[PDB]
């Protein structure tokens, strides 16, 4: 069976953990320990293909994790996530994309730019501005809400689709 190795990155507070859990376990966690980096697996169907997602929800901390490095060396696609009510998280996106380019030594890594928390009225990073950024990277941009599950499947599945394309 085919495995897709994904890495969810982004500034703190943006919703990396909520997006992953609401994907893997279909529920919205109110609080999930800030410190916790953990990988998540699940068998899903994407475009009529039964595959296994192997997702690393990153924590960004200093202490050495052999697993983290394993996900950086072999990870195939990335979600660069920010909150639409958190301007500073959008300003942090470039730093993560540059990191990813460093790890693969490639400007062409399958990535998805995600604006989480689309359920919230207070919006400081508007669509066009996020569309400008995603267009300058060459990647899909997807609006999500881990709270109401909106866009949650598309964000991860679009990443798997960017991975298939890169694979030929």
């Amino acid at each position: 069976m085919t495995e897709y190795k994904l890495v969810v990155v982004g500034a703190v507070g943006v919703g990396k953990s909520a997006l992953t859990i609401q994907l893997i376990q279909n529920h919205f966690v109110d609080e999930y320990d800030p410190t916790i980096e953990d990988s998540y697996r699940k068998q899903v169907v994407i475009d009529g293909e039964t595959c296994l997602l192997d997702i690393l929800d990153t924590a960004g901390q200093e202490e050495y994790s052999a697993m983290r490095d394993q996900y950086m060396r072999t990870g195939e696609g990335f979600l660069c996530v920010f909150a639409i009510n958190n301007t500073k998280s959008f300003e942090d996106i470039h730093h993560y994309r540059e990191q990813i380019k460093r790890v693969k030594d490639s400007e062409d890594v399958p990535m998805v730019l995600v604006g989480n928390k689309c359920d919230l009225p207070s919006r400081t990073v508007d669509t066009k501005q996020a569309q400008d950024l995603a267009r300058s990277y060459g990647i899909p941009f997807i609006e999500t809400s881990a709270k109401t599950r909106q866009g949650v499947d598309d964000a991860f599945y679009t990443l798997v689709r960017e991975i298939r394309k890169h694979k030929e």
């Binding site: 507070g13 609080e31 800030p34 958190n86 500073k88």
Partner: peptide
């Protein structure tokens, strides 16, 4: 640094 702010921001 997820580890500390967590649900907030920074």
């Amino acid at each position: 640094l997820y580890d500390v702010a967590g649900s907030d921001k920074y």
